Every structure is written in C-alpha cells, then in structure tokens.
Amino acid sequence: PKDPDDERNAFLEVRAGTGGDEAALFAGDLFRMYSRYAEARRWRVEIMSASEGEHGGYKEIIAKISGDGVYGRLKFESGGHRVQRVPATESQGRIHTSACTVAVMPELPD
Amino acid sequence: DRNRTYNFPQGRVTDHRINLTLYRLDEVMEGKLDMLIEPIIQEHQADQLAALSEQ
Amino acid sequence: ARKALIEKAKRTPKFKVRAYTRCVRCGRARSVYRFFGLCRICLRELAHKGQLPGVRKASW
Amino acid sequence: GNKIHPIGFRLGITRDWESRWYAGKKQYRHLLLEDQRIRGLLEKELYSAGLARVDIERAADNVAVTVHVAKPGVVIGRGGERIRVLREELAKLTGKNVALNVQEVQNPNLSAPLVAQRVAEQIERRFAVRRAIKQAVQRVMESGAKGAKVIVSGRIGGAEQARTEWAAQGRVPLHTLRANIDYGFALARTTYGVLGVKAYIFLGEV
RNA sequence: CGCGGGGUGGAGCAGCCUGGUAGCUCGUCGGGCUCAUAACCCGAAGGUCGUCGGUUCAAAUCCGGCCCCCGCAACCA
RNA sequence: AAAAUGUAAA
RNA sequence: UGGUCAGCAUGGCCCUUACGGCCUGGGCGACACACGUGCUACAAUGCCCACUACAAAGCGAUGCCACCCGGCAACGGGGAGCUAAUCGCAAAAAGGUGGGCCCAGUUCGGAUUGGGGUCUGCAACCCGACCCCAUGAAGCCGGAAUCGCUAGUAAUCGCGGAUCAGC
RNA sequence: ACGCGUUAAGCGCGCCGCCUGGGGAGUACGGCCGCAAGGCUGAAACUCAAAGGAAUUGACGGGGGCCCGCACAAGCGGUGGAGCAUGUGGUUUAAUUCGAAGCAACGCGAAGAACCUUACCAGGCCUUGACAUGCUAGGGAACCCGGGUGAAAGCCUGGGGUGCCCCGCGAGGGGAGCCCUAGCACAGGUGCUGCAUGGCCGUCGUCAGCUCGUGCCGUGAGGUGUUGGGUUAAGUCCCGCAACGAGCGCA
Ligand SMILES: CN(CC[C@H](N)CC(=O)N[C@H]1C=C[C@H](n2ccc(N)nc2=O)O[C@@H]1C(=O)O)C(=N)N
Ligand SMILES: [Mg+2]
Ligand SMILES: [Mg+2]
Ligand SMILES: [Mg+2]
Ligand SMILES: [Mg+2]
Ligand SMILES: [Mg+2]
Ligand SMILES: [Mg+2]
Ligand SMILES: [Mg+2]
Ligand SMILES: [Mg+2]
Ligand SMILES: [Mg+2]
Ligand SMILES: [Mg+2]
Ligand SMILES: [Mg+2]
Ligand SMILES: [Mg+2]
Ligand SMILES: [Mg+2]
Ligand SMILES: [Mg+2]
Ligand SMILES: [Mg+2]
Ligand SMILES: [Mg+2]
Ligand SMILES: [Mg+2]
Ligand SMILES: [Mg+2]
Ligand SMILES: [Mg+2]
Ligand SMILES: [Mg+2]
Ligand SMILES: [Mg+2]
Ligand SMILES: [Mg+2]
Ligand SMILES: [Mg+2]
Ligand SMILES: [Mg+2]
Ligand SMILES: [Mg+2]
Ligand SMILES: [Mg+2]
Ligand SMILES: [Mg+2]
Ligand SMILES: [Mg+2]
Ligand SMILES: [Mg+2]
Ligand SMILES: [Mg+2]
Ligand SMILES: [Mg+2]
Ligand SMILES: [Mg+2]
Ligand SMILES: [Mg+2]
Ligand SMILES: [Mg+2]
Ligand SMILES: [Mg+2]
Ligand SMILES: [Mg+2]
Ligand SMILES: [Mg+2]
Ligand SMILES: [Mg+2]
Ligand SMILES: [Mg+2]
Ligand SMILES: [Mg+2]
Ligand SMILES: [Mg+2]
Ligand SMILES: [Mg+2]
Ligand SMILES: [Mg+2]
Ligand SMILES: [Mg+2]
Ligand SMILES: [Mg+2]
Ligand SMILES: [Mg+2]
Ligand SMILES: [Mg+2]
Ligand SMILES: [Mg+2]
Ligand SMILES: [Mg+2]
Ligand SMILES: [Mg+2]
Ligand SMILES: [Mg+2]
C-alpha cells in the first residue's frame, strides 16, 4: 500500500469535445459543477486561462485548485464525459449528444 | 473511454468504470458530486487492498 | 408526502388555524372555494358536465 | 387542446343539469359532495348495464334518483332484489329518502356515453382500433342520427408516438347552439397506458 | 561593459521637451436591439507610470545606480 | 444602397 | 416532439426501520448583483383642511355589526336591525364650496428608523397588518431603448367580492 | 414530364460523331501541337449510395399584384431613470423545495408560505404505519379518564369495566364490534420519466381558411372544385365557371 498522493492538491483542465457549441456550453456546465465544490465547501480556485465559447461557456479552461482533497475527492476522473441533452442551440426541438475531456494535473516540484 | 455519461432530457448519470448507473443528475449537476465520488473511492478495496490480501 | 396530509386538514390537529381547506375530489390547497370545497379545476370539470346544479356559461 | 366543452355550452340552453336542487349556504357543499358520492356506487356498479346517465334531484330533504340504462333487466336483480339492495346501500350513507325511479334508454346507438363506454373497452379488451371507430360512427349514424363524431387519442395500437384518429359524418356543428349533442366520454385503461375517447352524437336542432 | 532609443489601465500607442496637466484605439464588465451571435446603439470599469535613490514646494516629466526590450559596436592586423 | 452568420440525433 | 406525472388520472422504472409516516425549529421572505410586472411620486391642472353632494355592483346568523360611550387612534366593552329590494358593511372618491400654502428636496415627496400601542391567532426573532410619536431619504420629469389604447375608448377616480383567523 | 410538331424531338433508310453511375478529373503519366499562356488525346488508385432530369405540394424570397390588424403613421398617457411592492435569473446557504423559458416564462401554477399550507433543511419518534381492502392469531370491550414523559411527536403506565351474542341456573362456550398488538399479502411516495399517454389549456388565431363525395384532367404525385371579375368582417354572397354537390369553419 504505497503512494504519496492518496489525497493531494491538483490543477484541473477542461476542453471542448464534440457538440461544438454544446461543447463549450456543456464544458461551462461542468465548470459550475466543480466551481460549486469550491466556496460552497472551502476551496480557492482561480481560472489559469480559458478560451471563450461563442454561444456560451468556454472551450478551453483550466483551474488552479486550493484545499486538500483534490486527490481524494477529484483524482478519479481524468477522461471523457459524454452528455445527451436537448441543447439550447437547436433549430427545431430534437435531442443531441455531446462530450468533453478533463485532466487532473497533480503537483510537480516547484 | 467515456468516464461518465449524463442525460438531462432523461435525468441520469452513468460512470462507465464501476457499474454506477445510479443517478440523480439534477442536484449533482448543481455540483453536489459527493454522491458518485464515494463509491468510486470505495472501488479501491477490490482494487488495491485486494491486491495486498493474498495476490 | 401527499396522502397523510389529506386527512390532516379534516381532523383539526391542535388549533383553529391548522385546518386548511382541501379540495374533496383532487385535494388541492390552492384555489379551494369554500362554497364547493372544490379546487378551481374540480370546479371546472364538474361545471361543464352539468353536475354542478344551476350553473351555466356566464356571458355579459 | 383548446376546444370547447359541448355540454357546458348548453346548460340551460338545450340540455338540463345532471343534478338539480336549490340549496342554502353552508349546506350546498356536502349536498353536492353527496351528489358526487351518490354516483360513486352508480358509476361503479351500473356500468355493467351501460350506465347512460344519472339524474339526481332533492326536494325538501327527499332525494329522488332516476337512473337511465341500456338494458334494465340487470338493474332489477332477481325480481325486486338488486334494485332493492340499491336503495338499501343507497340510504346507508345517504340518510335521505332514496326513492329511485330507474329510467330506460330506448336506443343505445343514440346515446354517446353509451357508444363511448363500448368503444373504449373494445380497445381495453384489444381490437382493431380504427375499424371500431368507423363501425361505431356507422351503426349510430344510420341508427337514428343526422350527424355523428368520435375520436381516440393516445397510443393507438400502443405506438410510442401517440396518434389521434377519428371518424365523422353529417352536419355536426359544435359551433351551433341549437344542436342537440351528446358528449360521450370514456377512459380506457390498457396494458400500455390510458386511451381517451370522446363521442359526439348529434340528435337534431331544437 | 562601450554609446543610441525604449519601459504608462489587459493588447498596442500618446503623455516627458516646457514638472502641478493622464489622453486615442481596441478590448473588458452593465445595459439595449435580435429568435439568437456578431455588427451597431447606451453607459461604466480599469495604470502610485521599469526599478530605485533623489531634486524641488511637489515628480509619468528632472536627475543617478541597478533589472529588462531593442539598435549599432567589442577593431582579433 | 442598407445589414453577416445558425455546428452535430427520427 | 408547446405546457402539465406537482391538480387528478396514468403505462414503465426505481425506495420498502425508508425516496414511505409524525412532530418541531428552520425554510421557500437569505443579498456584492441583474432582469420582468407593477405601485407611488417628482407637484401650483396642484398638496393640505373642514362642510359637502352624486354610483353601481357585490357580499353578511361560521357572520354583516348600526348606535351609546372609552379612546389622538387603530380599536374596546357594551348593544340594536336583518333568513336580508327590511336592517348591516357605507362617508363612493374624483366633485362642488370656504380656507391655507407660495416656487423650496418645500406643506411636494413618505422611503428608512428608534422607542411606544391596538388587533388576530398557541403563536409575531426570522415574519404579518393596522396605530401614534418622531425620522423626513432617492426623486425638479427619466440614458440607448420601449408599451397600451380609434369612443364613453384611452387617461383618471373610488368601491367590491373570491383566497382568507389574520395579512 | 417539359415540350416537340413540314424549320420534328413524328414515320423510315443511309453514313459519321458520341454516351455507359457521381466525385477523382479533362487531372496524371505518355504522345503530338504551341513562342508561351496552353491546347488535343486522356486513365487509375481511392472513394461515395448516390449523382442526376422533368414535374408536384408546400415553405421561403432584401420577387411581383391585391388586401388586412393600434402594424407604423396621426395623437394620448406610460415603465426603462428614482424609492418601495411582487415574480425570475443569479448567488448564498444547514436548506435557500419544485415546475414555468422569446412572442405564448418572469403580480405565472399561488384566489392568502408565521407553524398550517408544505412537497426542502435539521435534529428527537412511525414499521400492515396518517391511509382504505383482507388473513390467521393472543383477545380487551365501549373508554370519559389520568399521570408519567417531552419542544411536541412520542413512548411508558395506571384507575378503569355491571353493553350487544349465548339463555349456559352455570362464579367461565365462543360469537360482536372495536381496543389491541406483535403478525398474512399490503399500503404509501409531490421519487424519475409531458420524448411512453388521457384530460385540460396556451399558441399562430376570430385568422378565413381546411377538407370530403362523384365527375372530368394528368402515366403519376396531384389538379379541379376552393380559380377568376365583383362584394364582404368573412370560402359573405353575386356573376361566371369541368365541374356539381357536401362537412368541419365566419355566419
Ligand atoms: C582593408 N585595408 C588595409 C589597409 C592597410 N594598408 C593594411 C592593413 O591590413 N591594415 C590594418 C592594420 C592593423 C589595423 N589595426 C587593427 C587592430 C588594431 N587594434 N589596431 C590596428 O591598427 O587595422 C588595419 C586595417 O585592416 O585597416 C584597406 N581597405 N585599405
Ligand atoms: Mg511532489
Ligand atoms: Mg437548486
Ligand atoms: Mg451540501
Ligand atoms: Mg330544500
Ligand atoms: Mg333516514
Ligand atoms: Mg330498446
Ligand atoms: Mg370496467
Ligand atoms: Mg363519411
Ligand atoms: Mg378503465
Ligand atoms: Mg535609455
Ligand atoms: Mg505594456
Ligand atoms: Mg496619438
Ligand atoms: Mg528619464
Ligand atoms: Mg502628471
Ligand atoms: Mg445619439
Ligand atoms: Mg526614470
Ligand atoms: Mg557589432
Ligand atoms: Mg450555430
Ligand atoms: Mg437518424
Ligand atoms: Mg406616474
Ligand atoms: Mg395653487
Ligand atoms: Mg383657496
Ligand atoms: Mg417647480
Ligand atoms: Mg438632489
Ligand atoms: Mg444619449
Ligand atoms: Mg415615446
Ligand atoms: Mg401535354
Ligand atoms: Mg426533314
Ligand atoms: Mg429524345
Ligand atoms: Mg459527339
Ligand atoms: Mg467520371
Ligand atoms: Mg469532354
Ligand atoms: Mg507509367
Ligand atoms: Mg504532357
Ligand atoms: Mg377589404
Ligand atoms: Mg434560486
Ligand atoms: Mg426552481
Ligand atoms: Mg399572496
Ligand atoms: Mg416557520
Ligand atoms: Mg414534566
Ligand atoms: Mg406505546
Ligand atoms: Mg383499563
Ligand atoms: Mg345482560
Ligand atoms: Mg341481551
Ligand atoms: Mg335469553
Ligand atoms: Mg352448556
Ligand atoms: Mg426511446
Ligand atoms: Mg385528387
Ligand atoms: Mg385546392
Ligand atoms: Mg375575390
Ligand atoms: Mg362556403
């Protein structure tokens, strides 16, 4: 049972997947999903950078995270997050699917 | 490779790694994500602790 | 919780305030006339059918 | 949906109330609450005989309660029996005199809630659905009327996209007030959901 | 190190000469129009001015040390 | 003369 | 693929000392913000004051409560008349008439607040509504933009029921 | 099909040219021509389940004609600006219950949130329960009543009783409700799903339209009627009319 980061500190990136506008729209959706884990709890989270979204949210994002527990309560999701919604960017009223990428960046010696 | 799958026009979650199709979408998309965060860190008993118990 | 609260209005629990007017068919705490003991919609549908005596389409 | 209710359209115009009585203030409530409850067993029990229409009235306390049906041989029981254990069960929560004078319904093809109940459980029990709308409006048209109409909403045959479908023929002017129209409605519980059936027999001007 | 020019709201530029004197464009946040986004229309937000001494009453401005951007040199006969 | 654009599921 | 499974109904899925059931505090009323609907004003075609006139509707024996008197008062105790074209809520307000202001953040404006009171309802910290003192705030007519209405209609006045112990 | 139609796209014979799914691509390699720019000849790998022609019905048009609505114009007051009330986003929180989303969500469901309403939070209690069917099983009766106990819920625990049924003289048959329990399926859920549905309503919209029958026209989808001239608030009539009637509509 050997490891340092069982419960460490981390950065967190989010990028545009498919869905295009509902790529940046859903990436901003999960932004507030993580942003509300912050100061509804304790955490101090700056955005390090974030390229904008034309119809809302951001395509590229990245957030420097504070408070211990970003690697005991956030570690287990460096992958994809497909979503199936009726996007607020529809011509008619049909259902679509989207997806996004996430990246839990730990803490190199600095 | 998709870690989790959501669905507001159905209200659901599904983490393709446990079996965790167990869902609530609404007050999880709100950000209260300690619902799915727990059984997945509980899925480390059959993982690493089961690796160090006999083999 | 919506069934327990059905009878709770009827039997006056503890005071002359906690006896809110329910509807008799649907059971809604909103729009409940005390004339019919009926919600606006139970009132609606039973009005058109003829089942409410003497009531007809208003117009002036 | 948006369309008008045809019966409410003719209360004191072409069709009289299903229940009728004058009533004092705080008495009206539980006086109607009885009316409705009174039909509780009436809607329940008599359906098996094709419950055409209830017709409640209340004099000085006394409540006469005439009930129409397609074939009353059901309503009577073994002589004076089911028709008696009607009044027995009646006044046992009524408390008012339950003097019922059971009516009759000449032609069940010209009563709409009769055509409704039948078509409805024709799909409950599962049948050809459109045919039973066409046959219905058929032997009801020639069966006494000048015009007739009936509809089915919800899952016809049980498709996921719930269609509506209907049949109709002859001058059926819901806009025109002078028209006698029977609004026949019938719910229809099925394995896959709940079907809506509205009926429209037009019996003539007046 | 030698000389030359530069460093000011987020980006790019004025402002220094003649001190007290902070503007132009973009963008940014708030609002409008619009089905919506840009456009466009209405408002506001934003720099102790490289860095330090110091001159004066007082420094974006004058002066000097150091950090940095850039330009020519450091001739090797 | 004015005046752009609408990603991807029946 | 408008709205509603949260009015009710309803096919399917899930909970089963618990997603079901009871109480009690608390909550839907939180406050750097933003928006929609409205209210009341910025006044002199006005605000204040007493006399004073004139509508319909609509509601009331779970109540509507005259009139006496207490009271600055809200209201309070007393008490009459009604199954109500009987009597009650009821002074309709804009209005007419006398007076008073005197171009000012004012006698316009009534926000906000401190202590002091009545009424409901077990109950008034969150949390009500009315009352008295006092406090007397933004607002001197509205950026870009934007709404209704063609006649008893716009505009502007009071009254009224339903929800309801109260609001 | 459009349209062709003695100027054939008709009926025939003769001769040449050319086509053989779309892209790739009139490109590449070769060959010939050119001063060049380039022309002629002219493939394939790969790739798609189409590419297409005419015609129909719609929708759209910064096309046309004729109409209409407070649509603008013409006038009258108005929020946006202030302070307050109310509803949402948002944020916050222990929870800040849910739904409503341009027109058609935002004084909306709410025609009454202090607890109640109450579906949320928070902590003390319910386990066939606040709730209606019904099964055995221990069986008290009704229970006014009472303390204990607590914020209340609750859980403890007394003092109690002379019912009805049996006629058994009978100090005791069970039956009876209900009280009660533990205890047989049960309940119950405002938990998700309007993108599984009924019903109900908003909405284009009081807009003047939309269809059916038979006939004829077109191989057909379809057309006609329902178009046109006139009139109307209007598919309201009128005259005409390969149409004649009819239903749902305005009436
Ligand atoms: C390049 N030249 C050469 C000129 C002379 N006659 C020859 C020559 O080589 N002179 C060189 C002699 C050395 C001189 N030199 C260099 C370095 C130094 N520190 N000092 C010097 O004097 O620089 C001269 C130079 O190159 O011009 C011409 N174009 N004329
Ligand atoms: Mg490390
Ligand atoms: Mg929330
Ligand atoms: Mg939490
Ligand atoms: Mg009577
Ligand atoms: Mg009796
Ligand atoms: Mg017969
Ligand atoms: Mg049945
Ligand atoms: Mg027919
Ligand atoms: Mg049924
Ligand atoms: Mg320099
Ligand atoms: Mg700079
Ligand atoms: Mg310049
Ligand atoms: Mg200098
Ligand atoms: Mg200066
Ligand atoms: Mg201008
Ligand atoms: Mg300097
Ligand atoms: Mg050099
Ligand atoms: Mg787009
Ligand atoms: Mg498809
Ligand atoms: Mg005003
Ligand atoms: Mg004056
Ligand atoms: Mg005067
Ligand atoms: Mg003035
Ligand atoms: Mg001022
Ligand atoms: Mg201006
Ligand atoms: Mg204007
Ligand atoms: Mg032809
Ligand atoms: Mg020829
Ligand atoms: Mg040819
Ligand atoms: Mg050729
Ligand atoms: Mg080719
Ligand atoms: Mg060619
Ligand atoms: Mg070769
Ligand atoms: Mg070549
Ligand atoms: Mg006209
Ligand atoms: Mg909120
Ligand atoms: Mg909500
Ligand atoms: Mg209210
Ligand atoms: Mg409370
Ligand atoms: Mg005690
Ligand atoms: Mg107990
Ligand atoms: Mg006892
Ligand atoms: Mg005895
Ligand atoms: Mg006896
Ligand atoms: Mg006996
Ligand atoms: Mg014996
Ligand atoms: Mg499906
Ligand atoms: Mg045809
Ligand atoms: Mg046509
Ligand atoms: Mg015409
Ligand atoms: Mg016609």
Properties at a glance:
part of a larger assembly; 4 chains; A: 110 residues; alpha+beta; four-stranded antiparallel beta sheet; 1 helix; 6 strands; 24% strand; D: 206 residues; GMP Synthetase, Chain A, domain 3; Ribosomal protein S3 C-terminal domain; three-stranded mixed beta sheet; 5 helices; 7 strands; binds blasticidin S; binds magnesium ion; RNA-binding
Quick overview of this protein structure:
The structure is cut from a larger assembly and holds 2 copies of chain A, 1 copy of chain C (60 residues) and 1 copy of chain D (206 residues). Chain A has one helix at 21-35; strands at 11-16, 46-49, 61-64, 83-85, 96-98, 100-105. With 110 residues, chain A is an alpha+beta fold.
Would you write up a description of this structure?
This is part of a larger assembly, with 2 copies of chain A, 1 copy of chain C (60 residues) and 1 copy of chain D (206 residues). With 110 residues, chain A is of the alpha+beta class. Chain A has a 4-stranded antiparallel sheet, with helices on one face. Chain A has a two-stranded antiparallel sheet with strand order 4-5. The longest helix of chain A is centred in the first third of the chain and has 15 residues, at 21-35. Chain A is built from 1 helix and 6 strands. By secondary structure, chain C is mainly α. Chain C has a single domain (1-60), classed as 30s Ribosomal Protein S14, Chain N (Irregular), CATH 4.10.830. The longest helix of chain C has 10 residues, at 40-49. The radius of gyration of chain C is 14 Å and the shape is elongated. In chain D, the strands form 2 sheets. Chain D has a 4-stranded antiparallel sheet with strand order 5-4-7-6, covered by helices on one side. In chain D, strands 1-2-3 form a 3-stranded mixed sheet. In chain D, α4 packs antiparallel against α5 (131-141). The longest helix of chain D is centred in the first third of the chain and has 22 residues, at 25-46. Chain D has helices spanning 25-46, 73-76, 84-94, 112-124, 131-141; strands at 19-20, 51-57, 65-69, 147-153, 165-169, 180-190, 193-204. With 206 residues, chain D is of the alpha+beta class. In chain D, 28% of the residues are buried. The interface between C and D is medium-sized, with 18 and 23 residues. One magnesium ion binds next to loops of chain A. Chain C binds 4 RNA strands through residues 1-9, 11, 13-21, 23, 25-35, 39-42, 44-45. Chain B: It is found in: Cytoplasm.
